[PDB]
Amino acid sequence: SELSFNYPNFQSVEDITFQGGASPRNETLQLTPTDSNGIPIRQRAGHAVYSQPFQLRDTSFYTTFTFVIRTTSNSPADGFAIFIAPPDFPVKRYGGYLGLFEPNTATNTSANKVVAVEFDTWVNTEWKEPRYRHIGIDVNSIVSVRVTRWQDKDVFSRSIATAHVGYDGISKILTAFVTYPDGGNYVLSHVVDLAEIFPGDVRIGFSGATGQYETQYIHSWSFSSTSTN
Numbered sequence: 001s002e003l004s005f006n007y008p009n010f011q012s013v014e015d016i017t018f019q020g021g022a023s024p025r026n027e028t029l030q031l032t033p034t035d036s037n038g039i040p041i042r043q044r045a046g047h048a049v050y051s052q053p054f055q056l057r058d059t060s061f062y063t064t065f066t067f068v069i070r071t072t073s074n075s076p077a078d079g080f081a082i083f084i085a086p087p088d089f090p091v092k093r094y095g096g097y098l099g100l101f102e103p104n105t106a107t108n109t110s111a112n113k114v115v116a117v118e119f120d121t122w123v124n125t126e127w128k129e130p131r132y133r134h135i136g137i138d139v140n141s142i143v144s145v146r147v148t149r150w151q152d153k154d155v156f157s158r159s160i161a162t163a164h165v166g167y168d169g170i171s172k173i174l175t176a177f178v179t180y181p182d183g184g185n186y187v188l189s190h191v192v193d194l195a196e197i198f199p200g201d202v203r204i205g206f207s208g209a210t211g212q213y214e215t216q217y218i219h220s221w222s223f224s225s226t227s228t229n
């Protein structure tokens with residue numbers, strides 16, 4: 001179906017739903033909570049999602065957002081993701097589950113219905129993932145179906161980075177481009193039929209988790225979807 005929205009900043013959150021530890025702060029979406037001294041709270045997850053459901057049958061979309069990873073040490077955890085799931089998808093487990101999965105089914109593709117582009121700051125040993133920080137496409141599992149190295153210079157840049165995520169409903173391809181000002185660029189694509197996974201309504205949004213020593217912020221976000229008939 002057709003949907004568009006545009007948040008150049010978040011001084012309005014009229015159509016954003018906050019769950020778990022996410023909240024609106026300083027004109028941004030703050031995905032995990034900080035204490036009254038500004039210190040990242042361990043072992044929390046949060047979601048900030050566009051509140052209106054849409055459908056993926058016969059649909060393409062384009063979305064872009066800007067984000068900042070704020071770290072307070074060289075060992076930040078866990079990262080965040082932009083995700084699509086059903087409208088009643090709740091905040092799930094903190095830590096390396098990124099607010100998207102739970103321990104007993106996190107690698108079981110038959111037990112999950114969620115697609116995401118993840119920005120993963122902590123190399124987990126509890127499941128298979130690369131030995132470096134990485135950006136990944138996830139389809140119904142915390143073990144990414146496509147993954148690439150995310151350079152530490154960019155992770156720790158303090159820069160406002162830009163993501164572009166697009167879904168071609170004809171070819172059934174999900175693509176992320178991530179760019180850093182005077183830094184790295186990243187390209188990831190995967191063939192996946194999102195209408196087959198999600199035959200009814202979905203919501204799109206963000207999920208962040210700690211971990212430790214990290215806070216994730218979304219500074220702007222826009223979206224457009226269009227029919228492919």
Ligand SMILES: *[C@H]1O[C@H](CO)[C@H](O)[C@H](O)[C@H]1NC(C)=O
Pocket residue numbers: 077078094095096097122124126210211212
């Ligand atoms: C355990 O804690 C580290 C931080 O010390 C990371 O958050 C990691 O993701 C955690 N492991 C799991 C399985 O969540």
Ligand SMILES: [Ca+2]
Pocket residue numbers: 118120129134136142144
């Ligand atoms: Ca990962």
Ligand SMILES: [Ca+2]
Pocket residue numbers: 078096120121122123124129
């Ligand atoms: Ca991880």
